Amino acid sequence: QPHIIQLKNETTYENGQVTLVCDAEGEPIPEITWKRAVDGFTFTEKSLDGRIEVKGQHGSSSLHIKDVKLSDSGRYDCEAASRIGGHQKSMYLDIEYAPKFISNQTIYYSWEGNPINISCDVKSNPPASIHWRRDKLVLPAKNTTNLKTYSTGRKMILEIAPTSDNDFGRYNCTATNHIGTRFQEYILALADVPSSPYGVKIIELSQTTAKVSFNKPDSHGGVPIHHYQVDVKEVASEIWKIVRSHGVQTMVVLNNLEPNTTYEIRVAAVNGKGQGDYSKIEIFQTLPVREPSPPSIHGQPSSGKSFKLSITKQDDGGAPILEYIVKYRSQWLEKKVQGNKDHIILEHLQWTMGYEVQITAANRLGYSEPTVYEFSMPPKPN
Ligand SMILES: *[C@@H]1O[C@H](CO)[C@@H](O)[C@H](O)[C@H]1NC(C)=O
Ligand SMILES: *[C@@H]1O[C@H](CO)[C@@H](O)[C@H](O)[C@H]1NC(C)=O
Ligand SMILES: *[C@@H]1O[C@H](CO)[C@@H](O)[C@H](O)[C@H]1NC(C)=O
Ligand SMILES: *[C@H]1O[C@H](CO)[C@@H](O)[C@H](O)[C@H]1NC(C)=O
Ligand SMILES: [Ca+2]
């Protein structure tokens, strides 16, 4: 009746090799099978890659792996089976290795007076002891009052309060366990302000507004652009006014400009360190105040032999409409009404007749092009 007497936990190192051994008693002499817990593969007296092979020694088995991978770790099951019965137990293969660094970022940017934390992240088995250093000097040392290190469990942090072109440069994070010492080099670099935005264009223009469009700088200086600043100045003025973009949009709308006015502008990106270089100056001129746009009208019958035109407010042109001029025929007749007006009543018409009408709007600048409108009077009532 098979009974396993020895099946010990094993430890080995990555890329090394290991031997798992199951010892079992019993009459008749027990047969022995290995199963790998993870994928449930079974082994007895292969395999493909040829890394793993099993050899038996009458009442005892051994499973040998060469070139151990981290995926070899975990539980392995030994079953000793015969005609009369079976016994099964389990063991664990632990795999050790020199520390590995899994930090996704090794270059960091800051500037004088701006505190920054650099993080070192390490997987290792057994757990490593970890230190930050510069040329074999562990940090902070007593003579580096601007440095501090923290451990959070899964990270080792070096906090730098930069205050000298000496706080910038390379730092080593070094980790060691009994397999060995490994290290990862980090860089703290001096951030800069952004370079010039370019390809600046006025891509929309009106009387009192304009939208400026541009390309982002080829250099953000090492820390992300936060927003953009557009300076805008009347050529005839000495005072620049400031417009901050909405976030990182490469387009800014200028509001409240004066009509028919020549403006100069320039754009600069701002990052955490400060304001970047200005683009080349760009010039544009806002549209002029003009005459009103052509009026828009429609009508309905108004008793008795009259008709009422209603005004659907239209583009002012920058100066108040103070006068509508309705001329109608079907030779012509004129008629004027005031800007604040809502409608116009034409009177003394004939039944069943059709009329030709032209409407003009006027402001301090002049008259619009006339709007043509025609209508048919209804038949006579009884
Ligand atoms: C084998 O390792 C496991 C951890 O996976 C632990 O229970 C102990 O160290 C060993 N178990 C037995 C039963 O030997
Ligand atoms: C750096 O990390 C430590 C530990 O979490 C934290 O207390 C400290 O405020 C951080 N410093 C900076 C510059 O963010
Ligand atoms: C980090 O360690 C390596 C190996 O000792 C060394 O070449 C390099 O100069 C070190 N960097 C720092 C900042 O000490
Ligand atoms: C501390 O910093 C100074 C300045 O570079 C350096 O010369 C000195 O070696 C450091 N002191 C030690 C070894 O702890
Ligand atoms: Ca620069």
Q: What's the CATH number where 238 sits? A: 2.60.40.10
For the Cβ of 164 lying below 6 angstroms from any atom of ligand 4, the answer is no
Task: Say if residue 74 is in the same domain as residue 3.
Answer: yes
- The three-state (H, E, C) secondary structure of the chain, written as one string: CCEEEECCCEEEECCCEEEEEEEEECCCCCEEEEEECCCCEEECCCCCCCCEEEEECCCEEEEEEECCCHHHCEEEEEEEECCCCEEEEEEEEEEEEEEEECCCCCEEEECCCCCEEEEECEEEECCCEEEEEECCEECCCCCCCCEEEEECCCCEEEEECCCCCCCCEEEEEEEEECCEEEEEEEEEEECCCCCCCEEEEEEEECCCCEEEEEECCCCCCCCCEEEEEEEEEECCCCCCEEEECCCCCCEEEECCCCCCCEEEEEEEEEECCCECCCCCCEEEECCCCCCCCCCCEEEEEECCCEEEEEECCCCCCCCCCCEEEEEEECCCECCEECCCCCEEEECCCCCCCEEEEEEEEEECCEECCCEEEEEECCCCCC
Distance (Å, whole) CA 97 – CA 342: 88
Distance 185 CA to ligand 2 centre (A): 20
The DSSP bridge pattern shows strands 225-234 and 241-244 to be antiparallel
Task: Say if residue 334 is in the same domain as residue 247.
Answer: no
For the Cβ of 107 lying below 6 angstroms from any atom of ligand 4, the answer is no
Spatial contact of 191 and 167, defined as CB atoms under 8 Å apart: no
Contacts with 141 (C-beta within 8 Å, 6 or more apart), sequence order: none
Domain edge (last residue) among 250, 274, 290: 290
Nearest CA owner, ligand 1 atom 4: 92
Spatial contact of 32 and 78, defined as CB atoms under 8 Å apart: yes
Spatial contact of 254 and 261, defined as CB atoms under 8 Å apart: no
How many beta carbons lie within 10 A of that of residue 45, not counting itself?
Answer: 11
How many beta carbons lie within 10 A of that of residue 183, not counting itself?
Answer: 15
For the Cβ of 172 lying below 6 angstroms from any atom of ligand 3, the answer is yes
Q: Give 17's strand partners.
A: 66
Spatial contact of 339 and 277, defined as CB atoms under 8 Å apart: no
Closest ligand 3 atom to the C-alpha of 169? 13
Domain edge (last residue) among 66, 97, 128: 97
Spatial contact of 299 and 349, defined as CB atoms under 8 Å apart: no
Distance (Å, whole) CA 94 – CA 72: 8
Domain span holding position 276 = 193-290
Distance (Å, whole) CA 194 – CA 147: 28
Contacts with 145 (C-beta within 8 Å, 6 or more apart), sequence order: none
Among candidate residues 216, 120, 248, the one with its CA nearest the CA of residue 174: 120
CA angle 150, 152, 158 (to 5 degrees): 30
For the Cβ of 218 lying below 6 angstroms from any atom of ligand 3, the answer is no
Task: Say if residue 199 is in the same domain as residue 174.
Answer: no
For the Cβ of 37 lying below 6 angstroms from any atom of ligand 4, the answer is no
Task: Say if residue 91 is in the same domain as residue 115.
Answer: no
Distance (Å, whole) CA 170 – CA 56: 55
Distance 159 CA to ligand 2 centre (A): 7
Task: Say if residue 29 is in the same domain as residue 120.
Answer: no
Nearest CA owner, ligand 3 atom 5: 135
Ion ligand 5, residue ranges at CB < 5 A:
192
Tokens 């019958």 found at: 301
Task: Say if residue 344 is in the same domain as residue 285.
Answer: no
Task: Say if residue 340 is in the same domain as residue 266.
Answer: no
Distance 142 CA to ligand 4 centre (A): 9
For the Cβ of 141 lying below 6 angstroms from any atom of ligand 4, the answer is yes
Distance (Å, whole) CA 323 – CA 346: 16
Integer CA distances (angstroms), 342 to 313, 362, 365, in order: 9, 15, 22
Integer CA distances (angstroms), 144 to 116, 138, 150, in order: 15, 10, 15
Task: Say if residue 84 is in the same domain as residue 6.
Answer: yes
Number of structural domains, the chain?
Answer: 4
Distance 55 CA to ligand 3 centre (A): 47
Among candidate residues 91, 98, 71, 101, the one with its CA nearest the CA of residue 13: 98
Q: Which two tokens stand for residue 380?
A: 């006579």
For the Cβ of 134 lying below 6 angstroms from any atom of ligand 3, the answer is yes
Closest ligand 2 atom to the C-alpha of 159? 1
Closest ligand 2 atom to the C-alpha of 116? 13
Q: Indicate which ligand has the atom closest to the C-alpha of 6.
A: 1
Task: Say if residue 211 is in the same domain as residue 201.
Answer: yes
Integer CA distances (angstroms), 340 to 240, 271, 307, in order: 38, 51, 20
Task: Say if residue 3 is in the same domain as residue 90.
Answer: yes
Largest CA distance in the chain: 132
Distance (Å, whole) CA 173 – CA 12: 26
Q: Is the peptide bond before 140 cis (omega within 30 degrees of 0)?
A: yes
Spatial contact of 296 and 371, defined as CB atoms under 8 Å apart: yes
Spatial contact of 148 and 159, defined as CB atoms under 8 Å apart: yes
Nearest CA owner, ligand 2 atom 11: 117
How many beta carbons lie within 10 A of that of residue 43, not counting itself?
Answer: 18
Spatial contact of 52 and 61, defined as CB atoms under 8 Å apart: no
Experimentally, the structure was elucidated by X-ray
Spatial contact of 273 and 195, defined as CB atoms under 8 Å apart: no
Contacts with 299 (C-beta within 8 Å, 6 or more apart), sequence order: 307, 308, 309, 310, 373, 375
Domain edge (last residue) among 97, 124, 144: 97
- In a 13 Å sphere around the CA of 89, the CA atoms on its Cβ side amount to 15
Q: Which two tokens stand for residue 25?
A: 């008693």
Which residues have C-beta atoms less than 6 Å from ligand 2?
Answer: 115-117, 150, 152, 157, 159
How many beta carbons lie within 10 A of that of residue 132, not counting itself?
Answer: 23
Task: Say if residue 46 is in the same domain as residue 86.
Answer: yes
Backbone angles phi, psi at 305, to 5 degrees: -90, 60
Distance 172 CA to ligand 4 centre (A): 16
Find the discontinuities in the chain where C to next N exceeds 2.5 angstroms and give the residue preceding each.
45, 330
Integer CA distances (angstroms), 359 to 92, 300, 307, 320, 331, in order: 96, 16, 15, 17, 16
Spatial contact of 206 and 165, defined as CB atoms under 8 Å apart: no
Spatial contact of 375 and 328, defined as CB atoms under 8 Å apart: no
Residues 133-150: b if buried by 16+ CB within 10 A, e if exposed = eeeeeebbeeeeeebbbe
Task: Say if residue 146 is in the same domain as residue 167.
Answer: yes
Q: Is the peptide bond before 379 cis (omega within 30 degrees of 0)?
A: no
Q: Which two tokens stand for residue 177?
A: 């366990």
The DSSP bridge pattern shows strands 86-101 and 10-13 to be parallel
Distance (Å, whole) CA 260 – CA 207: 7
User: Residue 28, class by beta-carbon neighbours within 10 Å (0-12 exposed, 13-18 middle, 19+ buried)?
Assistant: exposed
Among candidate residues 141, 264, 282, 279, the one with its CA nearest the CA of residue 201: 282
Which residues have C-beta atoms less than 6 Å from ligand 1?
Answer: 9, 92
Distance 379 CA to ligand 1 centre (A): 107
Distance (Å, whole) CA 161 – CA 333: 86
Distance (Å, whole) CA 208 – CA 183: 61
Q: Indicate which ligand has the atom closest to the C-alpha of 186.
A: 3
